[PDB]
């Protein structure tokens, strides 16, 4: 006969009834890419604030190749 | 039931030390005169004596076989009583939900006493109304003043007693032919020989019939330090 080691079997599913438990569409099982992006931004802000102290006090002279109403100027 | 705790060790079997030492009188006592411990060992001794005799089982009718094991044959009266007992026990820790009650099929409200408090919540959906509590007393067909649902009290009563599993057994089960101690001895020798004891309840039971501490090793078995 043939057998499966219980330790490596898959988790049993929730029973399908009138009262069925379902977590498949919740998206709460694990941290997603958005969470790891927040971590990346936190690291970037932490490094950036220390590296460039004058960033919070930017220069006021404005020089635009295509003026201030051109999209590249805004960013 | 969900409101019961874990099964105890006794819920499965009893220790042999609880076996009554006067086995000869135990097997002759009528069922109505046997206590919980006495009844347990009467059934186990008599039940295992028939089950440990393979050559006789095929020729034994189910009625006789059920009697030997102490199992009660079901009939409409006994089934009715047992069913209402379990419903009462279930409702101790479970919700009370069922079909809408009418004159033809009143809501059944099991009770041991003459009275039990009940609430009516109306029908389903919009027909459901606020809880209306009332005292459901025996002998009246109660009608909710709001939804006109019909309630009735069912009493688990019988001859100055309330229905219990033991009461049902005593009322309906009939003692058969008196247990023969020769069968106990015959089965005892079948499974217990030359220091091998594969039928231990019979070994103890046979020892008690012979007095106490007669069979090999039983004196050492009964000697305790505390």
């Amino acid at each position: 006969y043939k057998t499966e080691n219980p330790l490596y079997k898959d988790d049993e599913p929730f029973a399908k009834t009138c009262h069925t438990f379902d977590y498949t569409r919740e998206g709460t099982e694990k941290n997603g890419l958005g969470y790891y992006c927040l971590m990346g931004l936190w690291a970037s802000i932490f490094i950036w604030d220390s590296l460039y102290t004058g960033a919070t006090m930017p220069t006021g002279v404005h020089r635009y190749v295509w003026g201030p109403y051109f999209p590249t100027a805004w960013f | 039931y969900r409101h019961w705790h874990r099964m105890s060790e006794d819920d499965w079997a009893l220790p042999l030390d609880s076996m009554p030492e006067d086995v000869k009188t135990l097997m002759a006592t009528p069922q109505t005169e046997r206590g919980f411990v006495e009844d347990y060992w009467y059934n186990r001794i008599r039940g295992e004596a028939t089950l440990l005799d393979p050559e006789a089982l095929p020729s034994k009718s189910y009625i006789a076989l059920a009697r030997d094991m102490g199992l009660q044959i079901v009939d409409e009266p006994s089934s009715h009583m047992m069913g209402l007992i379990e419903l009462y026990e279930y409702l101790r820790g479970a919700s009370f939900v069922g079909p809408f009650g009418t004159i033809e099929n009143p809501v059944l409200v099991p009770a041991v006493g003459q009275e039990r408090v009940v609430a009516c919540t109306g029908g389903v959906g919009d027909e459901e109304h606020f809880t209306l509590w009332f005292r459901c007393r025996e002998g009246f067909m109660y009608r909710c003043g709001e939804c006109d649902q019909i309630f009735m009290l069912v009493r688990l009563y019988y001859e100055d007693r309330y229905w219990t599993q033991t009461l049902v057994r005593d009322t309906f089960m009939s003692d058969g032919d008196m247990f023969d101690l020769k069968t106990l001895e015959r089965v005892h020798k079948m499974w217990n020989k030359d220091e091998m004891v594969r039928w231990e309840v019979g070994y103890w039971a046979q020892d008690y019939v012979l007095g106490k501490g007669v069979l090999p090793g039983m004196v050492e078995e009964h000697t305790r330090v505390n």
């Binding site: - | 019961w4 705790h5 874990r6 026990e89």
Partner: protein, 230 residues
């Protein structure tokens, strides 16, 4: 059938315990208070005896009721610490520029964190054994050694500190927050001294309570360590 609950009709410990409390107020000697505290300990033990005897009722909801009571107690302990943190941070604007020596961030914090982490690991192993229906004798004595070091370190720190409660609100809050944590460590000693193996196992409320409580004490110290030492 039977009643859902086996009612308790009478009790006399409540009167004794309440009177014991009053004796603290009406004392004329602090020696009476010391002996009064022993009476309180004795009578509280009797109350714990009644809880164990209630197991005979075989009531499924008894475990749940006590567990949620502990949850409420844990919340009260957390909120009590919050008030001390509130007191500490209210005067934050007056700290760090007064002529007092604040604690170092290298020695005390590291060894205490390491020491208290070991305490958590010991309790975790106790929980694992409790899951496996198993026991290890040495574990309890590791806790006692752990508690011995904690007492020895805290006693020396207070005695060798060169600033006093009356020097500044900073010092008062430091001493008080550290004492409050110690008292909760001592309460843990009170609980853990009776740890044994009971054969009814996972229906024993004591095991889950001890695991929750020890975890709370350790996490509270992390907050204290960040606030005061780091």
């Amino acid at each position: 059938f039977e009643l859902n609950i086996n009612i308790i009709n009478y009790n006399y410990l409540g009167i004794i315990i309440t009177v014991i409390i009053s004796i603290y107020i009406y004392n004329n000697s602090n020696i009476i208070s010391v002996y009064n505290s022993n009476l309180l300990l004795i009578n509280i033990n009797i109350w714990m005896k009644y809880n164990i005897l209630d197991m005979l009722n075989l009531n499924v909801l008894d475990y749940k009721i006590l567990l949620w009571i502990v949850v409420i107690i844990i919340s009260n302990e957390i909120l009590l610490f919050v008030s001390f943190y509130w007191i500490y941070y209210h005067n934050y604007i007056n700290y760090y520029h007064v002529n007092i020596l604040i604690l170092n961030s290298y020695n005390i914090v590291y060894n205490n964190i390491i020491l208290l982490t070991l305490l958590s690991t010991i309790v975790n192993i106790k929980f694992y054994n409790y899951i496996l229906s198993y026991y290890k004798y040495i574990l309890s004595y590791l806790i006692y050694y752990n508690n011995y070091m904690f007492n020895n370190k805290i006693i020396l720190e207070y005695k060798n500190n060169s600033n006093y409660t009356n020097d500044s609100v900073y010092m008062t809050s430091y001493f008080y927050i550290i004492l409050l944590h110690y008292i909760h460590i001592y309460d843990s000693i009170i609980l853990i001294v009776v740890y044994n193996y009971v054969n009814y196992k996972n229906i024993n409320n004591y095991y889950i309570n001890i695991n929750i409580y020890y975890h709370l004490i350790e996490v509270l110290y992390i907050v204290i360590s960040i606030l005061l030492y780091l």
